[PDB]
Amino acid sequence: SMSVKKPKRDDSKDLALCSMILTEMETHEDAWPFLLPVNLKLVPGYKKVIKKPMDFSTIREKLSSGQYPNLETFALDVRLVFDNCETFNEDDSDIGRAGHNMRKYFEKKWTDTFK
Numbered sequence: 001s002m003s004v005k006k007p008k009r010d011d012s013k014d015l016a017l018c019s020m021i022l023t024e025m026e027t028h029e030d031a032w033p034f035l036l037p038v039n040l041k042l043v044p045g046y047k048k049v050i051k052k053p054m055d056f057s058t059i060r061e062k063l064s065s066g067q068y069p070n071l072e073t074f075a076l077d078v079r080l081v082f083d084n085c086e087t088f089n090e091d092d093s094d095i096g097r098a099g100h101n102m103r104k105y106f107e108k109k110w111t112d113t114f115k
Contacts, residue, residue: 014071018063021109025078026056028105030098034081050087054080071114078106 025031037055040047059077068074085099 011071015063015068017113018068018071018074021106021113022056022060022063022078024109025102025106026060028102030101031056033085033095033098034102046088050084052080052084054084056081075110079103082106 026035034056036057038046038050038053040053046053054077059074059081062068062077063074068077082099082103085095089096089099091097091100
């Protein structure tokens with residue numbers, strides 16, 4: 001509360017460390033469904049159904065331009081990519097499996113880097 005604070009966690013490396021995680025996600029062999037924005041002109045249903053589209057290239061641009069206020073807003077967008085994927089793709093599909101795999105890959109790196 002006023003004039004009463006928990007000890008200050010060092011957040012000075014968070015930006016660099018989120019960049020590293022994102023590089024690792026970008027270079028994963030199963031990243032291909034997530035590298036670029038879904039083409040809203042060419043994929044029927046996407047625009048109406050997926051209210052907040054997100055992809056790795058959009059997270060990279062947001063990260064690089066100081067549009068993440070803290071490491072939690074960064075994680076929320078990464079998880080949005082996978083939540084969107086599950087909303088639109090059957091579990092038993094190449095894309096559906098890719099999303100489960102990448103969400104696992106992410107959540108481990110997240111825990112190991114920050115928890």
